[PDB]
Amino acid sequence: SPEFMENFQKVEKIGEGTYGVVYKARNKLTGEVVALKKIRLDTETEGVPSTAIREISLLKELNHPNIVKLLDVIHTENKLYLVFEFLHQDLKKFMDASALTGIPLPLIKSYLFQLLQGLAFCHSHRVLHRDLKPQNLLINTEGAIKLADFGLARAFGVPVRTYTHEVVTLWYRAPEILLGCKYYSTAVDIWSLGCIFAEMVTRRALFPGDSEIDQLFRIFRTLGTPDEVVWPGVTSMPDYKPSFPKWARQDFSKVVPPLDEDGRSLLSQMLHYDPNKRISAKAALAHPFFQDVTKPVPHLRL
Template sequence: MAACVQAASAPAAGAARPTRKRTRIAMGSTDDYEETGRIGTGAFGSVHKARHRGTGRTVAIKRLAAADGSQVALLREASLLEASGRDNPFVVGFHGLARRPATMDLCLVMECVGASLHDLLHQRRCDGMPPLQEATVRAVMWQLLTGAKKMHDAHVVHRDIKPDNVLVADDRTTVKICDFGLAMYMAEPPPYETAGSLWYMAPEVLLGKPDYDALVDTWSLGCVMAELIDGSPLFMASNEADQLDEIFNVLGVPDETTWPWFSSAPFATKLIPKLNMKRRNLLREEFPKKKLSVQGFQVLSGLLTCNPDKRLTAAAALKHPWFATKMNAPELHLQKKEEVPSTLPKIKRIRVLCP
């Protein structure tokens, strides 16, 4: 019989800050599972496909790389995933923890979904397929924004939403957000870490803002939307300064009218002298009407707004008329393939404590 682990709640940082609820997480053994293959591997560890010996259910098992604090990190990720996925069909399902008897290390047991959105978009490009239809982009974004809204309602910020961390179900009707390794609770007091993947990181994080919020996720979702439309990432650089330059090349350099505190941000004081302050917003030129309708562009530009105070929340985006069309089990028009090799360079994933 499975034991349970109780995740401790963090102290609230004031009456206005949301608090974390205590959760009880099921605990089993890896001996209960038969591994059938490897799904992915990286600096974080590895994810394996496995079958539960008793029920026959196929699951994904995540192991963190051996490091000081890795077990605490896995417990933290389990708690965040459990909170985010509760009654949320667009976050990968959480099944509990499993302990490896030989080492006593913990593993995360999750729903096994399918290939990543990143790999499927890459495969479309390699096959010379045309861009996704706008109806498909709308269907994917409705699911991702709905998943993000429920996640934010649970007081969780993902901080690393990108196509690699979006899984596409085998029936091609559902997408699910995964990998909560960099997520955090809104109950945690600032300063917050600079965390995320460079190409999808919000400007306020790149600028060193220590008290960012859930709007960093909606920026990332805007980047995902742009990639769904064009098939390639919109902003690509190799360091934080160049990443900001890529963003401002398309969206224009903020000023006191569009973003009042921009010039006083820690990193901005070093960056502003190097920028061409006359740059204007070229986003519509990147996504003309032949690529994206007026209503679709309003959602995209609302998500890709540099000033987080003016950026769309997930809840506000879902109320936009672009999503008025009901989308019941939409076909996502992504080819069904178990494993799609990727030759794209790895995206810089950052987790650095702010000074």
């Protein structure tokens, strides 16, 4: 049954992502509240890159309890309206709301666990997120959290425009990307999630840089400047410069004080320099940190 924009009552703008703005809408025909992501695509060179649509089709294929539910796709001349399930809020706004007490360990541990489940599902389906941050992770009242606002590959890039203020996307960006390697892996999402793990425990972003080189130095100041020992092939990296300052690695009892050995074990495995040593989503799930994992309800509010 065909859906149209005239079917949907807009109620309010719930935020803006990388590729448009997202609206809280009310399907007048069901009374059901949904989220609409508007997408102005550019039939520029006619679109249809054939790399772009191939990846997007892998995205629509994904059905998992920890990936936001795409209900319908509405085409109108030069526009695309993505109909999503409506969800309560994002992880960033949640972390801000309770930055005064922190998120209880069981809820941190639960969110982390579900995110690894969602990523593990993506990674076995040849999908990467590429832009994992608290902003674009969505929670509900059940106690669930879901991946949203996926990134797109190959530099540019599917035929859409963005309209975005300067990134804070750098904060969660894996080092191999910051040193310019051409082919990266699923390990880039593990890094980002690892950073988010730390932020949930400390109530603050691990590596808040204002530029690519500033981002690398913040990583270096904390985990130490990597060499060929810790990371084979690092010195030959396209954007590696031997002029890099040498920093000694800090210890985790100071970087993430409330973490016990199991959390630090896992965090260090997620924050490994070398992508070929960095723990996978599927393997992170089997980690003794998640031995007593539960599904707590979030203490929610506006």
